Amino acid sequence: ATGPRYKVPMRRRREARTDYHQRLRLLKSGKPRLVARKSNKHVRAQLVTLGPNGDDTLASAHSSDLAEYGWEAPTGNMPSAYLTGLLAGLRAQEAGVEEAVLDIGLNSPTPGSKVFAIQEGAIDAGLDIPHNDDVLADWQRTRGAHIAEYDEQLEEPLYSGDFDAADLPEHFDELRETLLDGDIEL
Amino acid sequence: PSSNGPLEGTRGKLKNKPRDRGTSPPQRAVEEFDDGEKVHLKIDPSVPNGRFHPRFDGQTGTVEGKQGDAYKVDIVDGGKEKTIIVTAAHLRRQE
Amino acid sequence: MHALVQLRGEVNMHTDIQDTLEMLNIHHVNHCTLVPETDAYRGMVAKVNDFVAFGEPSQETLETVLATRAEPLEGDADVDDEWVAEHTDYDDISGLAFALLSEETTLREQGLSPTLRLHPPRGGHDGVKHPVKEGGQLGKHDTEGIDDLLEAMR
Amino acid sequence: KPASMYRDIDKPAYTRREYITGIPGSKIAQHKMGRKQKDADDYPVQISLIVEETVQLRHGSLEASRLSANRHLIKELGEEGDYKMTLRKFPHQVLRENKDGMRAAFGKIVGTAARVQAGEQLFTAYCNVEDAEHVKEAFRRAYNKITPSCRIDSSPAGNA
Amino acid sequence: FHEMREPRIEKVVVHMGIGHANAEDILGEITGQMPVRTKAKRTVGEFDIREGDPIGAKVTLRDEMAEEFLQTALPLAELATSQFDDTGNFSFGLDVTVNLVRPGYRVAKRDKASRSIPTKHRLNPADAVAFIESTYDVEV
RNA sequence: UUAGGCGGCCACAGCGGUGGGGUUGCCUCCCGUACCCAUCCCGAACACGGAAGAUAAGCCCACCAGCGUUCCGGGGAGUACUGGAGUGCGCGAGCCUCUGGGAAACCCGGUUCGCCGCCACC
RNA sequence: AGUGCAAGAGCAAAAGAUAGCUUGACAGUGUUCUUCCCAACGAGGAACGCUGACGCGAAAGCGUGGUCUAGCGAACCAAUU
RNA sequence: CCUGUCAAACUCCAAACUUACAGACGCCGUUUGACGCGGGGAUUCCGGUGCGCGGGGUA
Ligand SMILES: [Cl-]
Ligand SMILES: [Cl-]
Ligand SMILES: [Mg+2]
Ligand SMILES: [Mg+2]
Ligand SMILES: [Mg+2]
Ligand SMILES: [Mg+2]
Ligand SMILES: [Mg+2]
Ligand SMILES: [Mg+2]
Ligand SMILES: [Mg+2]
Ligand code: NA
Ligand code: NA
Ligand code: NA
Ligand code: NA
Ligand SMILES: [Sr+2]
Ligand SMILES: [Sr+2]
Ligand SMILES: [Sr+2]
Ligand SMILES: [Sr+2]
Ligand SMILES: [Sr+2]
Ligand SMILES: [Sr+2]
Ligand SMILES: [Sr+2]
């Protein structure tokens, strides 16, 4: 910008979306990356592989396409994240993918977070992913319990669009139920 | 030379071009080459490890297997055959 | 196709320039060779430029010189139309001459020695210390100039 | 010491003051002369002294010539005459002398000189059409104190 | 348009740069929340050779804590023009600093895809004096 | 790609600027702290839970060249420099001719306000 | 800017700063290059492996001392494990 | 703004050229066996001159 000698960061560095130092460390494994990402309303898992002209996504799942299997609940919570990971995971098996490394991009490794939920889901789907159990939220939180009890302290329904009053982690089960099953069109 | 260390006279060849300054892209550090492949040798100023003796900059050897992640490249220094342990970051495919 | 004639000796000649001459089959002063006009050969003559005289000869001249100085790959067998006819893909020296100039074949290809061992220039040449443009004999010549030389060395 | 000792450019450029110490101050008093508050475009005539050979001119020579030239323009146009002359070169080249046989011969620093390629303008004056022959004389005296031969070329000036 | 543009208070930073502390207790009362120590850098002839070491304390208030402080703090001062930043900030007073900014300031403070706020969205001195003055006090 | 995710080349992509875009869609800003997690003090951030509002930021779309940058035309310039050769010139430092290469600055006019790959998506 | 010290070079979500934790400045054994361009020569050095045991990290991964190039010593004998 | 100058230990630029590898043509090798490899024997480790590029020195 300033002159001939000025150094401009690689595009994705100035867009502030890619941590290259962390990236290179991920790539050093030789395994596909389980790219876990999240937005205010959604969550998304992708199994990315290295390619000659850019990365190559071999499979993926999005919280949005969760309803496509019987989900009427929100898509920015824990139950959401896990199930998406699993959905993405299952599809990964389809394409022949067997192992992955967790890439949480610019998200923080907070214990019990969603990117870890996405990871536990993808692992349950059958993907071999280097992990650590005592960094994953407790099973019930994944189900969505923490929110039910939050809804317990009612007075004004937690959810605006009536999906249900006292919410449901039991639905999480019906949805996971449907995914771990064979039939299901991936 | 006044001294005979490895980086003697390496001022230019080991200095980065202003705009190439800073951490280099991971792509070429992770690249994979096959045995028999021709590769040009050129140290990347920005990359500390995996380098070969500067004196060999500019060579175009032949991947003949690898050691760990580093590559074993065969070259002919003058009339002598030498094997060079070098990481992808400092290699480039030929042609 | 250019005719190449060595006019300057090997003593004190750069070795890489001397080796180049030998690759073009000339090994003595006055010896002449016929080289196709390719990028590769082009570089070569440009390199030997200061110790030689070259240029494209006329069909006629090439015929005179072939008749007078062409030799078999081995032996003293005289090379004439009859020889040409019974040993080459041609009918006579002219058919050969034409083919060479058109670069369809080479002396070696037709069992002829790659070199024409010419004779010293009758009446001498224009000197080997200066190029053609400066009045000398070194360097690229005119088809007419090359002809004058080759004929004088017939 | 004879200029024969330094007039030629037969040594590497030696100018880096960050590695040289004890460099004698220049003897050149001024590079801008005449009425320097006025511009150069403000004059009808522009004459320069052109060096004919590439050389090295020691500061003691730039000062002698510049002086013996401006001194003339002063004596002819007055201590405030309507003219302006410029010595456009500065002595960047540091000179030595081995002043103990050839052992440890690198020399001690003894002076400075300006490198001037042939055809370049060493000095340049801008005068009115009147004082044109006064500047030509100032240069005649100037080129008599510098090694090379010079041409007194007349740039803007078609009043012949 | 005006809604997502009308200013707000990002933070109220009250601090007592001393130079060697025992003053934390008052700020703990005047603001309502815990204060933090202030380390320094560079050695100073003024018996200040201990780089890392207590020299001050500060409190950063946000939302109610912030406002509830200004309600009783602003009156204590006599705001002026110069006393304002070029970004729309102003500090008075024990220092009392008020950082004002428009709605989506987060874009420059978040981790992922952060970005610098365009000059157009940056608060102005005039815009600052206004908003503020437009709430319990005068200007210059 | 009517706004997304991961990238490759890493300014042709920077700097600055103008215009346009969103009722249950997307990205955001945005709302809010019971939880997982968080601040040497601050739910600012990080993390989590969420939709009253919004297109003013960001972002995406269209575009402008004043600065920076890439490339190209024309001029500078076949100049500067130079590999090979010379019983060519010069008192000399040095120059010239023939042969094969061939800039840089700068001015003028254009180009450039990213290109491309994988995935997902009214 | 800083990165212990010459100079040249490297580094910005770090190779710099702060904080916390830690002892990989670890054991065994090699490959290669360097020392010694080409081209034989020791001690010394570096990069890169395999095995062992550990530290930190969610994990990929990083750690065979200090970002890279100076800080080094044969046989005989002694002491030591 | 304008205007006057520089760099062996400066470089936003940048040759000629030197150089790694490969293919092509050339030359060469498969009774003259090249390239490569093993072994016997050395001599040699005062050099000089021209030209080009130098560094020191008034030379
Ligand atoms: Cl994300
Ligand atoms: Cl090496
Ligand atoms: Mg150099
Ligand atoms: Mg014969
Ligand atoms: Mg003669
Ligand atoms: Mg708008
Ligand atoms: Mg002479
Ligand atoms: Mg002894
Ligand atoms: Mg002992
Ligand atoms: Na780089
Ligand atoms: Na403290
Ligand atoms: Na907007
Ligand atoms: Na050794
Ligand atoms: Sr000299
Ligand atoms: Sr003179
Ligand atoms: Sr908030
Ligand atoms: Sr003389
Ligand atoms: Sr040309
Ligand atoms: Sr290191
Ligand atoms: Sr060289």
mmCIF file of all heavy atoms in Angstrom, chain B residues 1-15:
data_model
loop_
_atom_site.group_PDB
_atom_site.id
_atom_site.type_symbol
_atom_site.label_atom_id
_atom_site.label_comp_id
_atom_site.label_asym_id
_atom_site.label_seq_id
_atom_site.Cartn_x
_atom_site.Cartn_y
_atom_site.Cartn_z
ATOM 1 N N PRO B 1 37.592 -15.779 1.118
ATOM 2 C CA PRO B 1 36.693 -15.436 2.246
ATOM 3 C C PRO B 1 37.561 -15.166 3.460
ATOM 4 O O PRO B 1 38.648 -15.725 3.583
ATOM 5 C CB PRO B 1 35.802 -16.645 2.524
ATOM 6 C CG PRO B 1 36.024 -17.518 1.272
ATOM 7 C CD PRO B 1 37.456 -17.210 0.795
ATOM 8 N N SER B 2 37.074 -14.314 4.355
ATOM 9 C CA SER B 2 37.800 -13.983 5.573
ATOM 10 C C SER B 2 37.569 -15.083 6.612
ATOM 11 O O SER B 2 38.422 -15.331 7.460
ATOM 12 C CB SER B 2 37.327 -12.629 6.111
ATOM 13 O OG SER B 2 35.929 -12.620 6.360
ATOM 14 N N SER B 3 36.408 -15.727 6.539
ATOM 15 C CA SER B 3 36.044 -16.820 7.443
ATOM 16 C C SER B 3 35.450 -17.917 6.562
ATOM 17 O O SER B 3 35.036 -17.645 5.433
ATOM 18 C CB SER B 3 35.006 -16.362 8.470
ATOM 19 O OG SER B 3 33.777 -16.051 7.835
ATOM 20 N N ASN B 4 35.389 -19.145 7.065
ATOM 21 C CA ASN B 4 34.883 -20.238 6.248
ATOM 22 C C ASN B 4 33.664 -21.004 6.781
ATOM 23 O O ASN B 4 33.554 -22.216 6.590
ATOM 24 C CB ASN B 4 36.032 -21.210 5.963
ATOM 25 C CG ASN B 4 35.715 -22.172 4.833
ATOM 26 O OD1 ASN B 4 35.439 -21.755 3.700
ATOM 27 N ND2 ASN B 4 35.754 -23.469 5.132
ATOM 28 N N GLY B 5 32.746 -20.300 7.436
ATOM 29 C CA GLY B 5 31.549 -20.948 7.947
ATOM 30 C C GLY B 5 30.593 -21.268 6.804
ATOM 31 O O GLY B 5 30.885 -20.951 5.645
ATOM 32 N N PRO B 6 29.441 -21.899 7.091
ATOM 33 C CA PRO B 6 28.448 -22.259 6.073
ATOM 34 C C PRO B 6 27.726 -21.085 5.418
ATOM 35 O O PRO B 6 27.449 -21.114 4.224
ATOM 36 C CB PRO B 6 27.476 -23.149 6.839
ATOM 37 C CG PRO B 6 28.336 -23.768 7.879
ATOM 38 C CD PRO B 6 29.141 -22.581 8.357
ATOM 39 N N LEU B 7 27.416 -20.058 6.199
ATOM 40 C CA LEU B 7 26.694 -18.906 5.671
ATOM 41 C C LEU B 7 27.622 -17.826 5.134
ATOM 42 O O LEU B 7 27.220 -16.671 4.961
ATOM 43 C CB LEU B 7 25.783 -18.312 6.752
ATOM 44 C CG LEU B 7 24.884 -19.295 7.516
ATOM 45 C CD1 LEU B 7 23.919 -18.502 8.374
ATOM 46 C CD2 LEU B 7 24.119 -20.199 6.558
ATOM 47 N N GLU B 8 28.870 -18.198 4.875
ATOM 48 C CA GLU B 8 29.836 -17.245 4.351
ATOM 49 C C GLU B 8 29.426 -16.856 2.938
ATOM 50 O O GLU B 8 29.226 -17.716 2.086
ATOM 51 C CB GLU B 8 31.240 -17.871 4.366
ATOM 52 C CG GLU B 8 32.339 -17.055 3.694
ATOM 53 C CD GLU B 8 32.356 -17.220 2.184
ATOM 54 O OE1 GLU B 8 32.323 -18.379 1.706
ATOM 55 O OE2 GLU B 8 32.413 -16.195 1.471
ATOM 56 N N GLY B 9 29.276 -15.558 2.705
ATOM 57 C CA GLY B 9 28.902 -15.080 1.386
ATOM 58 C C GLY B 9 27.459 -15.334 0.988
ATOM 59 O O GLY B 9 27.076 -15.093 -0.154
ATOM 60 N N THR B 10 26.646 -15.801 1.928
ATOM 61 C CA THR B 10 25.249 -16.101 1.637
ATOM 62 C C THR B 10 24.309 -14.901 1.767
ATOM 63 O O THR B 10 23.089 -15.075 1.812
ATOM 64 C CB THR B 10 24.733 -17.206 2.575
ATOM 65 O OG1 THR B 10 24.775 -16.734 3.926
ATOM 66 C CG2 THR B 10 25.598 -18.443 2.471
ATOM 67 N N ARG B 11 24.863 -13.691 1.810
ATOM 68 C CA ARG B 11 24.044 -12.489 1.965
ATOM 69 C C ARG B 11 22.858 -12.406 1.003
ATOM 70 O O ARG B 11 21.712 -12.252 1.429
ATOM 71 C CB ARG B 11 24.894 -11.230 1.802
ATOM 72 C CG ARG B 11 24.209 -9.956 2.313
ATOM 73 C CD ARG B 11 24.520 -8.792 1.409
ATOM 74 N NE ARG B 11 25.368 -7.772 2.018
ATOM 75 C CZ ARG B 11 24.961 -6.918 2.949
ATOM 76 N NH1 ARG B 11 23.714 -6.970 3.392
ATOM 77 N NH2 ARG B 11 25.789 -5.984 3.406
ATOM 78 N N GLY B 12 23.133 -12.493 -0.295
ATOM 79 C CA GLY B 12 22.063 -12.413 -1.272
ATOM 80 C C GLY B 12 21.153 -13.625 -1.353
ATOM 81 O O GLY B 12 19.938 -13.515 -1.167
ATOM 82 N N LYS B 13 21.726 -14.795 -1.609
ATOM 83 C CA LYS B 13 20.917 -15.995 -1.749
ATOM 84 C C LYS B 13 20.063 -16.391 -0.554
ATOM 85 O O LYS B 13 19.114 -17.162 -0.715
ATOM 86 C CB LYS B 13 21.788 -17.182 -2.170
ATOM 87 C CG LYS B 13 22.790 -17.622 -1.140
ATOM 88 C CD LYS B 13 23.336 -19.007 -1.462
ATOM 89 C CE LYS B 13 24.184 -19.008 -2.717
ATOM 90 N NZ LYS B 13 24.927 -20.301 -2.861
ATOM 91 N N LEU B 14 20.371 -15.888 0.639
ATOM 92 C CA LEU B 14 19.560 -16.245 1.811
ATOM 93 C C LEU B 14 18.755 -15.070 2.348
ATOM 94 O O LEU B 14 18.213 -15.118 3.450
ATOM 95 C CB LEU B 14 20.426 -16.846 2.922
ATOM 96 C CG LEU B 14 20.992 -18.237 2.614
ATOM 97 C CD1 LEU B 14 21.792 -18.757 3.795
ATOM 98 C CD2 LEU B 14 19.860 -19.185 2.314
ATOM 99 N N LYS B 15 18.683 -14.009 1.558
ATOM 100 C CA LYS B 15 17.907 -12.836 1.927
ATOM 101 C C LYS B 15 16.641 -12.898 1.079
ATOM 102 O O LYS B 15 16.681 -13.256 -0.097
ATOM 103 C CB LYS B 15 18.681 -11.554 1.624
ATOM 104 C CG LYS B 15 17.910 -10.299 1.964
ATOM 105 C CD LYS B 15 18.772 -9.033 1.874
ATOM 106 C CE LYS B 15 19.307 -8.798 0.465
ATOM 107 N NZ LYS B 15 19.578 -7.342 0.220
#
